[PDB]
Amino acid sequence: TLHKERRIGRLSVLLLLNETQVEELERDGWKVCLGKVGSMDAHKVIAAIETASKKSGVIQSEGYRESHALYHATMEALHGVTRGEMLLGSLLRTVGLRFAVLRGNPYESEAEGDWIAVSLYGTIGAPIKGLEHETFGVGINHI
Amino acid sequence: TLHKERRIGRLSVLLLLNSTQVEELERDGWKVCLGKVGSMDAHKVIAAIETASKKSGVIQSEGYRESHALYHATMEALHGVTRGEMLLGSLLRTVGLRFAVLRGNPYESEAEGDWIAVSLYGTIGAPIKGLEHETFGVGINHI
Amino acid sequence: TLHKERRIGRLSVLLLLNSTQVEELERDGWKVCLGKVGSMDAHKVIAAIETASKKSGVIQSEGYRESHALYHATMEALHGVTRGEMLLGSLLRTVGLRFAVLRGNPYESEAEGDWIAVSLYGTIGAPIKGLEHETFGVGINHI
Amino acid sequence: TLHKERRIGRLSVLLLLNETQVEELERDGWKVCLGKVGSMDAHKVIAAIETASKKSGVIQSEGYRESHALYHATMEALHGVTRGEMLLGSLLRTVGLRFAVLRGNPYESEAEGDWIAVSLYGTIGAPIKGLEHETFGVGINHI
Amino acid sequence: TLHKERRIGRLSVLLLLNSTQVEELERDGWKVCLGKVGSMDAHKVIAAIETASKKSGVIQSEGYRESHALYHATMEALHGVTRGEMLLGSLLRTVGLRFAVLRGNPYESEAEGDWIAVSLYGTIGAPIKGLEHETFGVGINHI
Amino acid sequence: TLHKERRIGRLSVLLLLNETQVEELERDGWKVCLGKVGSMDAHKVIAAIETASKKSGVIQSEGYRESHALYHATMEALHGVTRGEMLLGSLLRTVGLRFAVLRGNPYESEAEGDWIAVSLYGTIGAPIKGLEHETFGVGINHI
RNA sequence: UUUAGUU
RNA sequence: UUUAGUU
RNA sequence: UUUAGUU
RNA sequence: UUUAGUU
RNA sequence: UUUAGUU
RNA sequence: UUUAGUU
Ligand SMILES: N[C@@H](Cc1c[nH]c[nH+]1)C(=O)O
Ligand SMILES: N[C@@H](Cc1c[nH]c[nH+]1)C(=O)O
Ligand SMILES: N[C@@H](Cc1c[nH]c[nH+]1)C(=O)O
Ligand SMILES: N[C@@H](Cc1c[nH]c[nH+]1)C(=O)O
Ligand SMILES: N[C@@H](Cc1c[nH]c[nH+]1)C(=O)O
Ligand SMILES: N[C@@H](Cc1c[nH]c[nH+]1)C(=O)O
Ligand SMILES: [Mg+2]
Ligand SMILES: [Mg+2]
Ligand SMILES: [Mg+2]
Ligand SMILES: [Mg+2]
Ligand SMILES: [Mg+2]
Ligand SMILES: [Mg+2]
């Protein structure tokens, strides 16, 4: 069962929606990294999240296993952001995002191992400043 | 442009993850609605959100206009929750959700009128207590 | 290339939005079928179109070949009607449709053989009379 | 309920499928604009529709509200045209379209306000003239 | 990199299209599971695969971790079977399937841990014996 | 009903998963062609399959009919390979594939005519050698 | 409408 | 990788 | 198969 | 923005 | 969990 | 058309 005080999803969102906390999370044994990326190319968003996650040590830079887990978590978070079509520029829209990647075990059973959450928050709109609204996305996966 | 102090998406999410914070929101002119629904039928989730919204006065009970706006905002929030297939029970999964519906103008220009945000947070998993993880979804629309 | 006077898609739509215009079409060699179905179950819409098509002789009742072509044409028309999720009742929505199935060769070359067009027009909305708007869909396939 | 003689969807399609009518619609209080665009890039289709709609006065050029309503209506019409994947050139296909955008209140109740319909008709096929078939799409949204 | 002699996807498919080839696989360290299910309800297909996998010991019966990995692998295999809409009966179609679940490390590096492959082969068609064609699906995930 | 020894889908897969056989199939009256293509652009995969199929005589190079049947069969096979989003490079992923296209009548009734199967097998992953796993896809259509 | 659940 | 943008 | 509908 | 196009 | 099915 | 690739 999900440990009420280790809800990886909720924690990653709160961190993202409040501009320290990283330090408190790390003290709790969590692996975290924060970043920002804006683009009309989804691959640039994906790349930024992976590159920040590997450089901050949230996931191993060697091997495929963890990169695979992160890719799919990112894909799931992008569903919330794109809502139907995982396309940005080709559909004449752009995104400005802030992201957080959190890694650790959110369950009461230590046997569940590590899980990873990718959270995204920002704006999506036409390529004109102001012609936009907020967007959110959260993807969760096992490691 | 979006008003920093009136970010409807972020505000609805913070309320959902939290005292009548509703009072503060309402004092600032926002129409707010909070609820909870769990089911293996997406239509029940959709119905709960609509019913709570109309009863609480977040949207007009009469006419189609506002119901149309809410329906589509709900659809967009469901994308974040379902991530690919807007199906629950038919794909052997269930959801336990908490939801918030916020209505008001998040832009600096009063000419942008009212917008609506539907936010969802909870768990999705196999029909077995514990075999689940967190899920999130936010949909925004003009109304 | 498509024959200007034999544009199967346009012709099926004009018939649907309209006298035995069917007679004229049939006189020109077209196999025509007209019907109406309303439901919160997509399978019922699909079944009505197939049944009407085979009874009216628009497609062979025997074999799979032609049923396969019609099924996929129906699927494509349903995309225009559902726009994203090929779901009706499970997403708390209902459809009231009028449909037309036209069969014949729309190209200048007789070697292109027969093609089939499934056109749909009606309303889609919440399960409440009035809380709805128009919906449209056209699917085209070789047969 | 939908006013039988103000069916915005049907009207926009008929206008599109019959090469005046614009004048008659405008006399009835409707806002209309007709255009044509062909491309292997969906964003060019979207851009043409928005640019023609704002220059013809169908939607306000200032603010986001109406641009947002039009974008989503265009997205919905594109579902009918693309049928599954909102991709053109990346899936080795091209489209040649004629489009119509109609704005007004299609309901009996004046309280329903303005709604907008984006209708598309043309051909989609491989990037070779002749290797194509018809395509249609209609999206409807509130303003 | 993937080990030429341990290509989990290819091996699971060859087994499905074939003696205890299972014995050879098991002798090489693979955890194998074979089954068959037919239905117009995707959840039944999903359930059969999970139940057979846990009973045969392909994945842990306890905890969520491994069930989560299997669920997503099953979802991915279902994409190949359904091709667009992960729906069976609601779209008036039925499936008759044979399935295989293989678990083990397909890479040269032992650090990649275990991965799981879900393969499906059978027929999909209208609810009439004969009006059908073959269908295939393979999903791969880390576990 | 499907002829047990003329299962076009199974046959195309076996041919693809075992490095002659083409000769045996051709002797049985089958039309076959094998190829390989790798890319981060789906259109290049589609193009390679069409170009190899027309040059090997699996489908007629003249007219649209057969090209249309092949395009849709290829689209269906790509669903198995992409699993949700028919995107490669835009989602920061690449594919290395081997493909087979088989043409003939897989049914017991000679009246069912010719059908076509497009089968794909290879790897999909991040654009780094090794960071990948297997992928499969099979599409079947009537001619 | 006032959080779901077993193959 | 250290938030995008004009038809 | 001969247009649907309430949380 | 004033219909696209070759593997 | 040990292959489905009629408008 | 005669298997792709670095943020
Ligand atoms: N409103 C769009 C973004 C957009 C594009 N153009 C204008 N707005 C969305 O929901 O993603
Ligand atoms: N993991 C699934 C939910 C689930 C179903 N069964 C087990 N888990 C999801 O992401 O939606
Ligand atoms: N507006 C929805 C239909 C609907 C459901 N509830 C209200 N309206 C659509 O576009 O399909
Ligand atoms: N027939 C495809 C278009 C196409 C691409 N290549 C050949 N035809 C469609 O339905 O969109
Ligand atoms: N042809 C459909 C199945 C089907 C339904 N009805 C007839 N056939 C498919 O590809 O899934
Ligand atoms: N694992 C992805 C491919 C990938 C992209 N990056 C890393 N892997 C898939 O299933 O398609
Ligand atoms: Mg993967
Ligand atoms: Mg709508
Ligand atoms: Mg089929
Ligand atoms: Mg929007
Ligand atoms: Mg999951
Ligand atoms: Mg087509």
Q: What report would you give on this structure?
A:
Six copies of one chain form a homohexamer. The first copy, chain A, has a four-stranded antiparallel sheet, with helices on both faces. Chain A is built from four helices and four strands, in the order ααβααβββ. The first copy, chain A, is an alpha+beta fold and 143 residues long. In chain A, a hairpin with a 6-residue loop joins strand 3 (115-125) and strand 4 (132-142). Chain A is globular. Chain A has helices at 8-17, 21-27, 42-55, 65-82; strands at residues 31-39, 94-104, 115-125, 132-142. The first copy, chain A, has a single domain, classed as Hut operon regulatory protein HutP (Hut operon positive regulatory protein HutP), CATH 3.40.1510. Chains in contact: A-B, A-D, A-E, A-F, B-C, B-D, B-E, C-D, C-E, C-F, D-F, E-F. The interface between E and F is medium-sized, with 32 and 32 residues. One magnesium ion (MG) binds at residues 68, 72 of chain F. The structure holds six RNA strands.
